[PDB]
């Protein structure tokens, strides 16, 4: 939430549900990265 909180200010229209906006969503995204599913898609959003 500190790093990527509100930094998905992308000018395009692709939906990125696994973001770090609030605390429940950060928990969901962290759990998804933990279980190793699609975690390489939550990294490219955090990079760009």
């Amino acid at each position: 939430m500190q790093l990527f909180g509100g930094r998905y200010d992308f000018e395009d229209t692709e939906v990125r549900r696994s973001n770090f906006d609030n605390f429940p969503q950060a928990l969901i995204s962290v759990f998804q990265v933990l279980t190793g599913e699609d975690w390489n898609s939550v990294m490219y959003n955090g990079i760009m």
Partner: protein, 973 residues
């Protein structure tokens, strides 16, 4: 270097040769003679410049009154029929039979959608619509992204089935009606006569982005003018997707503003400020809207949100009253996403009496609080809209009108007045049309008076189109000169009728398109802007024309005779002529009609050849097999008779005219006898000139060809072999040389074109014209213009014999008023003839402009086509320039200096012609250069818009407008 007297002698010799040649070999005095020798075959009737304007104003008023009576009937029937609708909800067995436009018309489709049944039409072809038309039923157009068979549209298709009777009755009464259309508040449009839509969904490669609720006529008939104040929230929270959506939303909201609405786009992020260089409310025309659009697309999001400062800014800008405003519907549109402050104190202190509506738009997808925004919308008589995608932008930024129509429907029959719109381009490809609109109210218990729930909105908007050809046939211009015309203006400045209003859309700024970011087949959309060309942008602006404009905007009669400099047809020259404007108001509507009649045009020739022998004999002088006796002959393609149609393949038109005069004798009880008699008369006169005078000398020293143009249309070139080198328009009212030589009182030299693909330089020759001037009963008349095409080479010879050919000490050139080369002395200049003098010898021309022998007048042509830059054609503004003599002096000598050298020059103006002869030291001696001073259309951008709102033009808005009713509801949001 020669002295002044020997130079004057050279010039006198040259002018006494040129004038004598172009006077004897042309036939000016002979035609002047024969135009008075008969003096019985015609009569001289006056042109009462006052009565013509009153007759034309009465006829236009009658036409518009008829088109208004054709509207009130449709309104009454629509209200009556929808008052008794039953609201079915199952159309499986009680199908709706109708003709959906824009569908594949093969006789094999058999659509059979679940609920309705299509019609297959017969589609005869017709005139007054250059397309196929079926007068038996009414077509239907439904926006592409609206389901054709939902219950909300299946009823609007079922109760509007009773309009076709009134459509048919309206057209049966006045057979000359164009489209009659009912555009309902559900997108469903129904027009008559039926015609296939110009754009199917996917049968072409493009799609159809049309929506009745955004057209000019609908938006103007559905609500009174407004003072909108868009208020963007550009704080940090709106960054990302919602900002990309707010930009498009503001740009689509501005697209719903006519010229009578005023707009300004402020922004706020912990600090409120305007977004462009405007600082107040502007008039929301094409250029102002363009600047606001281009300034919105530059905003970025950063900061904290503070609604109090933004709303203070908005309510302050809506309380100015120093600037010109529409001053009817003070509203404000807050484009945001959602916050936590409802700002009750600002609303309490600013609009405690609920005078300014607040529409609130929540854009994008997010997890914020849409509570306070909904509260602001609900409290201030406004409405709350949600825009979560680019798809929902068109139908959300156009629904606020349904809220601005409440105080109009709550007024009754005091809000049903026909209201003509601006000039635009029809969507069914019919040219320039104006549309009269009249709203339609929903009455479902006006008897019991208990509903008032859906009866606060309007059903739709009726409309009937009036094409600007029906109007140009009420102001007939074939008894004036090529220099007199009609023109009628709005009470807004804009022109509705002018010889300079053209079907192309007016441009704004230099066009720039980026090809590198454009998919091949995606159908980038088009425009819906009207053609709003102001009066002072279709002519040259004086300090007197602004007086005439501001004087006939506010419905006043009168006239004024003054001395203005007029621009030629080809935008290259500039005259100096007397004009007499004579205006009047069209009593019924809010238009003002004027009439520009020059002096020498207060009398005209009416043909009075009642003997059939003379008519027949003269008619025998136009057959193409007789050219060798009377020279190549053209004919102006006018509406001589409703049978023969203008062709533009002028030889075919002449054939058809001959064969029509052959069958029916000129008595013509169902035909325009006046034009035909005039044409036969002038054909007789021109043929007598060719036979009696031109046919004696078959050829002369240098005359390549001699032509005669006249009113009526006849134009004859003597050598048929030369007729193939006559590029001029056959209609004698668009011949630039005709009008020019009519204005001047001396032989006008018309320079040829340069490097244009077509043989004019050594194949046609320099052109010379002069207007015939007769005196019948002490009254002036200019009925024809005779001319000559001097050959260039023989003129070079006559010119040289110390100006020896290809000299290297001096150059001796000849120009005309306009700065175009006509006769050089180097064989490197005189091979590029007709080119601008200041484009080959820049510094000398710049000095001539400096010492004030020439003078220019830059202008703007708001309807041009250019090639865009990277930053087949596009609409563009092109700055023009035209040079002309100003000083009356005859000789100008001196010396020009441009560093380390100095050239000597002497220029002298020929008498009784528009030529100047300049002798100067050659450029090969003095190395000089300033810049190419080019006279040609330049793709421009200005004038500066936000340095013009500080001092706008006069304007008389609509005095009647409806807002702020007491028995309104505003219980919706």
């Amino acid at each position: 270097f020669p002295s002044a007297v020997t130079i004057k002698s050279w010039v006198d010799k040259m002018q006494e040769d040129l004038v004598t040649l172009a006077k004897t070999a042309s036939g000016v005095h002979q035609l002047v003679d024969i135009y008075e020798k008969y003096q019985d075959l015609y009569t001289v009737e006056p042109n009462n410049a006052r009565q013509l304007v009153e007759i034309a104003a009465r006829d236009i008023e009658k036409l518009l009154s008829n088109r208004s009576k054709a509207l009130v009937r449709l309104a009454l029937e629509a209200e009556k029929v929808q008052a008794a609708h039953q609201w079915r909800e199952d159309f499986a067995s009680n199908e709706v039979v109708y003709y959906n436009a824009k569908d594949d018309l093969d006789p094999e489709k058999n659509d059979s959608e679940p609920g309705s049944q299509r019609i297959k039409p017969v589609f005869i072809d017709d005139a007054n619509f250059r397309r196929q038309v079926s007068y038996q039923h009414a077509a239907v157009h439904i926006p592409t992204d609206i389901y054709e068979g939902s219950t909300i549209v299946l009823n609007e298709l079922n109760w509007t089935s009773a309009l076709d009777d009134v459509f048919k009755k309206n057209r049966e009464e006045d057979p000359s009606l164009l489209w009659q259309v009912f555009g309902s508040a559900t997108g469903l449009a129904r027009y008559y006569p039926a015609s296939p839509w110009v754009d199917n969904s996917r049968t072409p490669n493009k799609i159809d982005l049309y929506d009745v609720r955004r057209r000019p006529w609908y938006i103007q008939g559905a609500a009174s003018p407004k003072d909108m104040l868009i208020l963007v929230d550009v704080s940090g929270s709106v960054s990302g997707l919602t900002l990309k959506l707010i930009r498009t939303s503001v740009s689509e909201m501005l697209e719903t503003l006519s010229d009578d609405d005023f707009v300004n786009v402020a922004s706020f992020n912990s600090n409120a400020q305007d977004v462009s260089c405007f600082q107040h409310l502007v008039q929301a025309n094409v250029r102002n809207k363009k600047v606001l659009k281009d300034a919105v697309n530059n905003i970025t999001a950063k900061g904290i949100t503070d609604y109090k400062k933004g709303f203070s800014f908005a309510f302050e800008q809506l309380l100015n009253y120093n600037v010109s405003r529409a001053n009817c519907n003070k509203i404000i549109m807050l484009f945001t996403d959602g916050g936590e402050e409802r700002a009750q104190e600002i609303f309490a202190k600013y609009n405690k009496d609920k005078k300014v509506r607040v529409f609130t738009f929540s854009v994008g997808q997010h997890n914020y609080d849409r509570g306070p925004i909904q509260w602001m919308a609900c409290e201030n008589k406004g409405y709350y809209y949600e825009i979560p995608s680019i798809g929902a932008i068109r139908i959300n930024t156009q629904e606020y009108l349904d809220v601005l129509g409440r105080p109009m429907v709550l007024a009754g029959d005091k809000a049903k007045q026909v209201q003509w719109t601006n000039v635009y381009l029809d969507a069914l490809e019919l040219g320039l049309v104006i549309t009269g609109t009249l709203p339609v109210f929903n009455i479902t218990g006006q008897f019991e008076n208990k509903t008032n729930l859906k009866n606060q909105l309007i059903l739709g908007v009726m409309g009937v189109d009036v094409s600007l050809e029906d109007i140009k046939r009420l102001t007939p211009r074939f008894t004036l000169c090529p220099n007199g015309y009609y023109f009628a203006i709005d009470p807004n400045g804009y022109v509705l009728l002018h010889p300079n209003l053209q079907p192309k859309p007016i441009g704004v700024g230099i066009p720039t398109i980026n090809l590198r970011k454009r998919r091949p087949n995606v159908q980038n959309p088009k425009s819906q802007e009207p053609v709003t060309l102001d009066f002072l942008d279709a002519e040259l602006e004086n300090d007197i024309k602004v007086e005439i404009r501001n004087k006939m905007i506010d419905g006043e009669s009168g006239e004024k005779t003054f001395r203005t400099l007029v621009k030629s047809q080809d935008e290259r020259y500039i005259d100096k002529g007397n004009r007499t404007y004579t205006w009047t108001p069209v009593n019924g509507t809010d238009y003002s009609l004027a009439l520009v009649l020059p002096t020498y045009s207060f009398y005209y020739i009416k043909a009075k050849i009642e003997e059939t022998i003379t008519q027949a004999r003269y008619s025998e002088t136009l057959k193409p097999d007789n050219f060798e006796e009377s020279g190549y002959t053209f004919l102006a393609p006018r509406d001589y008779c409703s049978d023969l149609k203008p062709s533009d393949n002028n030889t075919e038109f002449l054939l058809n005219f001959n064969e029509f005069i052959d069958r029916k004798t000129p008595n013509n009880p169902s035909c325009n006898t006046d034009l035909i008699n005039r044409v036969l008369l002038d054909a007789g006169f021109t043929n007598e000139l060719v036979q009696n005078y031109w046919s004696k000398q078959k050829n002369i020293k240098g005359v390549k060809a001699r032509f005669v143009v006249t009113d009526g249309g006849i134009t004859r070139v003597y050598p048929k072999e030369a007729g193939e080198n006559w590029q001029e328009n056959p209609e004698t009212y668009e011949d630039s040389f005709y009008k020019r030589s009519l204005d001047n009182d001396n032989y006008v030299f018309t320079a040829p074109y340069f490097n244009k693909s077509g043989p004019g330089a050594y194949e046609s020759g320099i052109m010379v014209s002069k207007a015939v001037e007769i005196y019948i009963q002490g009254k002036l008349l200019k009925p024809a213009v005779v001319g000559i095409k001097i050959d260039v080479n023989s003129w070079i010879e006559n010119f040289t014999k110390d100006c020896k050919r290809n000299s290297d000490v001096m150059d001796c050139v000849i120009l005309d008023d306009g700065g175009f080369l006509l006769m050089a002395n180097h064989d490197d200049y005189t091979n590029q003839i007709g080119r601008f003098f200041g484009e080959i010898d820049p510094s000398l021309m710049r000095h001539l402009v400096n010492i004030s022998v020439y003078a220019f007048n830059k202008s703007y042509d708001y309807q041009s086509v250019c090639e865009p830059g990277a930053a087949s054609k596009q609409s563009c503004i092109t700055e023009q320039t035209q040079y002309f003599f100003d000083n009356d002096s005859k000789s100008f000598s001196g010396v020009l200096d441009c560093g380390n050298c100095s050239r000597i020059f002497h220029v002298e103006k020929l008498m009784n012609t528009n030529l100047i002869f300049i002798m100067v030291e050659s450029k090969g001696t003095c190395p000089c250069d300033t810049r190419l001073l080019i006279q040609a259309e330049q793709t421009s951008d200005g004038p500066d818009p936000c340095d013009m709102v500080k001092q706008p033009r006069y304007r008389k808005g609509p005095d009647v407008c409806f807002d702020n009713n007491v028995l309104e509801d505003y219980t919706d949001c």
